[PDB]
Amino acid sequence: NTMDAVPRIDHYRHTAAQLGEKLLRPSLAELHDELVVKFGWINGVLVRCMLNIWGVMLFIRLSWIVGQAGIGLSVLVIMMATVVTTITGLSTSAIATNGFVRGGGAYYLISRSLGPEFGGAIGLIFAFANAVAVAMYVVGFAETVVELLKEHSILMIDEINDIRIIGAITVVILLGISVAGMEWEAKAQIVLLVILLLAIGDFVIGTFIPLESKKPKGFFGYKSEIFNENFGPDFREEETFFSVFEIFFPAATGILAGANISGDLADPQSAIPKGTLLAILITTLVYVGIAVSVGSCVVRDATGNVNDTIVTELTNCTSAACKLNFDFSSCESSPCSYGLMNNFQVMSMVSGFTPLISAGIFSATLSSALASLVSAPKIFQALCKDNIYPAFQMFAKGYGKNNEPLRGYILTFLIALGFILIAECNVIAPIISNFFLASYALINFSVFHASLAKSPGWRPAFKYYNMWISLLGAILCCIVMFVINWWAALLTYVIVLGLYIYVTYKKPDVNWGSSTQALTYLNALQHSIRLSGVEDHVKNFRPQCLVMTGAPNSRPALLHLVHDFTKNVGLMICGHVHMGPRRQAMKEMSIDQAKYQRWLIKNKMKAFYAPVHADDLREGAQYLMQAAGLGRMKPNTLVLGFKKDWLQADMRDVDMYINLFHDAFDIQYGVVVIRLKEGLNTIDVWWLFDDGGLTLLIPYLLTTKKKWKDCKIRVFIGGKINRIDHDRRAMATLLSKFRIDFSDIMVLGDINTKPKKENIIAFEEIIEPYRLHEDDKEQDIADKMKEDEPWRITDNELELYKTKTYRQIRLNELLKEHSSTANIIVMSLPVARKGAVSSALYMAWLEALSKDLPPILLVRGNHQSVLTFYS
């Protein structure tokens, strides 16, 4: 409260409201200003990741992959898939150990890492991918059970339909077991893991246990010549190495099935890393070991038959089959019985109890399917909670004591059932495999992008993640999805890009500190730094304007006109000076900053809103002109709206306005004054005095823009009579060397001539309330009144400023007579000597010159060399 307090965790909690009644930080103004189920890492992320990786391939098609591709090359396949998977694991660990991750899985990580765009895109893709991987795992189980009940005669319908029936029944059962909370299905996956490990152990023991009954088959029991033969990549008619990797890689996916449970984990940012990485390690070790064992234990082909005798007749027999026995030897002529390349149930028979390995297949398939079916709706409901796609505002309610996406479970069940009864899993497989690849690629790109933008808030807790390995992982994921069904990769990239576009044009109104935001800041900073090293030059001058807008709403069309000759060229800083007590005005600026900056961005005003606190408008603008900008983006021109209200405004205010003029001149700023009717085809430019070229550059830049592109830029000047043609030719060659594509140059000799009586008497009537009438009251009352500036010095300030006023009024008359048909007028701003002219008289000059006309820009330049005709 009154005294500063020691730091506590309570200060930084709930980020909007988290126990705010206790441990609330004291504000700087207060000190200064004077007066329900959660899973551990073992059973929540280790078991689930391990149990999701282990699927159909481990027990069915692995003997095939090690049989065709050689042992030394099948291990290469496994190692490449594991490099991709492990690099993605490090990336996921880096993302997960950054903050506290609320709910969902890969979606939440990627979204909160680098923006709702990639977040929503890849989250939707991953939710679909897991929802259908449910169907893939369950139909693998269907193939297993139908093979078992076709080898054992009893069957009900044709295989292509019995698979559908059994898959539908068991996916219904999977929904039932999953929809009943997560303690129950957690224990269910525990018992499935026990069964799976029993199957692995049975295979290992049986592989160490050879027998003569299986001798006719490829089973021989660790014979060295079998290993020597199987090292080679003995392929088949069609399957190439890339196709082999394509077959295997689905077995590599399934990691971060615990990360998808991040919403229900007891302690993320400590369970995700050492659960996912350790699960990948264990599963890869098991794959490699079992592959080398089965390759070293069984042979390619075996004419399994007792009639195949081990008598071993003395023949050449170059094949190493007869090296063990004449049985299962020399069957290459016709398609012999079975073997690694000719059978799949090798895994079953090399082991001991065939049931204890069959149960391995069922447990692996069910466990992987159940893990995917739990993971998909968590991701989906996290995605729907953020309402990136408002169409799915449902699927996020999550009925139950622990938020469980019942609707998400039903939706993923329907999707899985639909893809089961489609029964075309073979053709859909590459699409979904490289959806998984796309998700992994965006995770590694998540880490790389986060490390690329410095972002002091990046700072993850988990080391071992360096940026280049993550970039390599993204590249490898892209290359692998090219390897797997190139056109599927193109389709996946199209889907990603389409969702990206959809989200970036939706622009969900949400902010969670993307790495994209950090990169934006860092990029803008780096280019400002490189600009700071770029020396100035005439033909790279830009009108970079501080515009005393006030509130940017107050003068809209003025803002548009300035934006016209500053869009995509030069700077535009909309300055607004705030007033009054410091404490209240801090909050005033804080809200106006957001409001007006968003208003500019919404209205495509590439401008910069700069609020300052100051005692009055003059020294607030002094603040702005002195300090606004960054590097060589500091303003060089001050833009004002003509203070139309001076006849009614307090004369101190208009004096402040004129001293603003004078300050801008004093600190080497060009001044532009815009007088237009704000209630809401030639550009006429009367640039009678060489301001330095700015009075040319403004209309030319206006002609550059599309709005004024179809409008001539005819020019007027003043010159002595009898030299009219000479002056016009010199003017034409002068600005033809400036490449200002004029349309008609007019030369006026009527300047410096006494204007009509009506106009002079009108100006005298206007100035009468402020000319101080310095006739009587010689010095005492005269000096007493002059103790405040804003009166015109009758005698003193109308001696030569008499002809100054005459030129002003006559110029106004000339703009009436000649340029009244212009779409826009740009004319030299009159300059009065500092202190020599009463501010009232100078404002009267501006009124007299600028009144009753189309839009006017009274441009006076820095008197530098703004334009050039060199190169």
Ligand X SMILES: CCCCNc1cc(C(=O)O)cc(S(N)(=O)=O)c1Oc1ccccc1
Distance CA 757, CA 763 (A): 10
* Spatial CB neighbours of 269, under 8 Å, sequence gap ≥ 6: 96, 97, 98, 99, 100, 101, 461, 462
Q: Where are the alpha helices (DSSP H) in 257-315?
A: 272-297
Residue numbers 79-98 binding ligand X by CB under 6 A = none
- Per the annotation, does 54 bind a ligand? yes
Of the candidate residues 103, 105, 699, 718, the single one contacting a second copy (CB under 8 A): 718
Helix axes 106-151, 486-506, angle to 10 degrees: 140
Tokens of residue 479, six digits:
């290359």
Q: Is 408 annotated as a binding residue?
A: no
| Residue 290 in contact with ligand X, rule: CB under 6 A | no
Select the residue whose beta carbon is closest to Cl ion and give its number.
Answer: 253
Sole binder of ligand X in the list 265, 417, 420, 425 (CB under 6 A): 425
Q: Judge contact between 293 and 207, C-beta under 8 A.
A: yes
Residue 314 labelled as part of a binding site: no
> DSSP secondary structure string, 19-55?
STTSSPPPPHHHHHS-----B-HIIIIIHHHHHHHS-
> Is 137 annotated as belonging to a binding site?
yes
Query: Quick check: 734 binds a second copy (CB under 8 A)?
Result: yes
Indicate the residue among 309 and 523 with the shorter CB distance to a second copy: 523
Q: Where in 15-74 is the site for K ion (CB under 5 A)?
A: 53, 55
56 assigned to a ligand binding site: yes
Q: How many Cβ atoms sit within 10 Å of the Cβ of residue 706? A: 7
Q: Is 641 exposed, middle or buried (0-12, 13-18, 19+ CB in 10 A)?
A: buried
Residue 733 touches which member of ligand X, a second copy, Cl ion, none, C-beta under 5-8 Å by kind: a second copy
**Nearer to a second copy among residue 718 and residue 755 (C-beta):** 718
| Interacting partner of 567 out of K ion, ligand X, Cl ion, none (Cβ under 5 to 8 A depending on kind) | none
User: What string marks each residue from 514 to 543 as x (binds a second copy by CB under 8 A) or -?
Assistant: x--xx-xxxxxx-xxxxxxxxxxxxxxxxx
Residue number, 180 or 667, with CB nearest to a second copy: 667
Q: Name which of residues 575 to 634 contact a second copy (CB under 8 A).
A: 582, 586, 597, 600-601, 606, 608, 610, 612-614, 622-624, 626-633
Query: Which segment (50-58, 112-120, 199-207, 715-723) binds ligand X by CB under 6 A?
Result: 50-58
Q: Are 803 and 849 contacting, i.e. CB atoms less than 8 angstroms apart?
A: no
Which residue's CB is nearer to a second copy, number 598 or number 784?
598
Tokens of 342: 């000719």
Tokens representing residue 676 in the block: 């237009």
Q: Is 199 annotated in some ligand binding site?
A: no
Q: For the segment 522-581, give every residue that binds ligand X (CB under 6 A).
A: none
Contact pattern from residue 249 through residue 278 relative to Cl ion, giving x for each residue in contact according to CB under 5 A and a dash for the rest: ----x-x-----------------------
The answer to whether residue 869 forms part of the interface with a second copy (CB under 8 A) is: yes
364 is in an annotated binding site: yes
> Judged by CB under 8 A, which stretch of 137-145, 482-490, 651-659, 831-839 contacts a second copy?
831-839
Question: CA-to-CA distance for 550 and 555, rounded, in angstroms?
Answer: 8
Q: Which of residues 234-263 bind K ion (CB under 5 A)?
A: 254
Taking a C-beta distance cutoff of 8 angstroms, is the pair 560, 708 a contact? no
In the region spanning residues 293 to 352, those forming contacts with K ion, defined by CB under 5 A, are none
Question: Could you give the 3-state DSSP secondary structure of residue 236?
Answer: coil
Instruction: Kindly report the number of other CB atoms within 10 A of residue 459's CB atom.
Output: 10
How many whole angstroms separate alpha carbon 13 and alpha carbon 440? 32
Task: Return the H-helix or E-strand segment holding 856.
Answer: strand 856-860
* Contacting residues for 247 by C-beta, under 8 A, at least 6 apart: 57, 61, 65, 239
**Is 466 annotated among the ligand-binding residues?**
no
Select 426 or 871, whichever has its Cβ closest to K ion. 426
Answer with the entry of Cl ion, a second copy, ligand X, none that 55 interacts with (C-beta below 5 to 8 A by kind).
ligand X
**Closest distance of CB 596 from ligand X, Å:** 50
Out of Cl ion, ligand X, a second copy, none, what residue 755 binds, judged by CB under 5 to 8 A for its kind, is none
Among 114, 133, 347, 782, binds ligand X (CB under 6 A): 133
Establish if 464 lies at the interface with a second copy (CB under 8 A): no
Residues 6+ apart with CB under 8 A from 496: 121, 122, 125, 438
User: Phi and psi for 343 in degrees, rounded to 5?
Assistant: -160, 160
Q: Which of 53/294 has CB closer to K ion?
A: 53
Taking CB under 6 A as the rule, does residue 56 contact ligand X? yes
What gap in Å lies between CA 434 and CA 438, rounded to an integer? Answer: 6
Gyration radius from the chain CA atoms: 41
The entry of Cl ion, K ion, a second copy, none that residue 501 binds, CB within 5 to 8 Å by partner kind: none
791 in a labelled binding site: no
Query: DSSP class of residue 240?
Result: -
Q: Could you write out the DSSP letters of every residue in 350-412?
A: HSS-HHHHHHHHHHHHHHHHHHHHHHHHHHHHHHHHTTSSGGG-SS----TTTT--HHHHHHH
Distance CA 663, CA 570 (A): 22
CA gap 179, 520 in Å, rounded = 43
Residue 253, marked binder: yes
Q: Which is nearer to ligand X, 144 or 296 (CB)?
A: 144
Compare residues 49 and 125 and give the one whose CB is closer to K ion.
Answer: 49
Helix orientation angle between 159-178 and 406-422, rounded to the nearest 10 degrees: 170
Binder among 39, 45, 51, 61 for ligand X (CB under 6 A) = 61
Q: How far is the CB of 557 from a second copy (least distance, A)?
A: 21
Please work out the total of residues on this chain that contact ligand X, with binding judged by CB under 6 A: 22
Asked if 12 interacts with a second copy (CB under 8 A), we say yes
- Where does 660-802 show beta strands of DSSP type E? 670-675, 683-686, 715-718, 745-748
Which residues sit opposite 572 in a β-bridge? 545
What minimum distance in Å lies between the beta carbon of 161 and Cl ion? 31
Work out what residue 61 binds among K ion, a second copy, ligand X, none; the CB cut-off runs from 5 to 8 Å by kind. ligand X
Q: Does 433 bind ligand X (CB under 6 A)?
A: yes
Identify the CA nearest to 643 among candidates 652, 633, 630, 631: 652
Rounded Cα distance, 607 and 601, in Å: 8
Does the annotation list 532 as a binding residue?
no
| 699 interacts with, out of Cl ion, K ion, a second copy, none, CB within 5 to 8 A per kind | none
- Residue whose CB is less far from a second copy, 487 or 869: 869
Q: Which two tokens stand for residue 360?
A: 């391995």
369 touches ligand X (CB under 6 A) = no
Q: Go through the chain and tell me how many residues it has.
A: 871
721 binds a second copy (CB under 8 A): no
- 57 is annotated as contributing to ligand binding: yes
For residues 8 and 23, the answer to whether their CB atoms sit within 8 Å is: yes
Q: Which helix (H) or strand (E) holds 796?
A: none
Q: Which of a second copy, K ion, ligand X, none interacts with 559 (beta carbon under 5 to 8 A by kind)?
A: none
Known binding residue 367? Answer is: yes
Task: In angstroms, give the least distance from the CB of 140 to ligand X.
Answer: 4
Q: How far is the CB of 231 from K ion (least distance, A)?
A: 27
Hey, what amino acid is at 305?
A: N
CB of residue 485 vs K ion: minimum separation in angstroms? 18
Euclidean distance between CA atoms 464 and 709, whole angstroms: 58
Q: Return the residue matching tokens 């830049």.
A: 701
**Distance, CA of 77 to CA of 720 (rounded, Å):** 91
| Residue 33 interacts with a second copy (CB under 8 A): yes or no | yes
The size of the interface with Cl ion (CB under 5 A), counted in residues, is 2
Residue list 404-463, contact with a second copy (CB under 8 A): 454-461
- Binding residues for chloride are 55-57, 126, 250-251, 254-255, 436, 440
- Binding residues for K(+) are 52-53, 137, 250-251, 253
Kindly list the residues in this chain that would bind ligand X in the complex (CB under 6 A). 55-58, 61, 133, 136-137, 139-140, 247, 250-251, 253-254, 368, 425-426, 429, 432-433, 436
Kindly list the residues in this chain that would bind Cl ion in the complex (CB under 5 A). 253, 255
- Binding residues for Na(+) are 51, 54, 364, 367-368
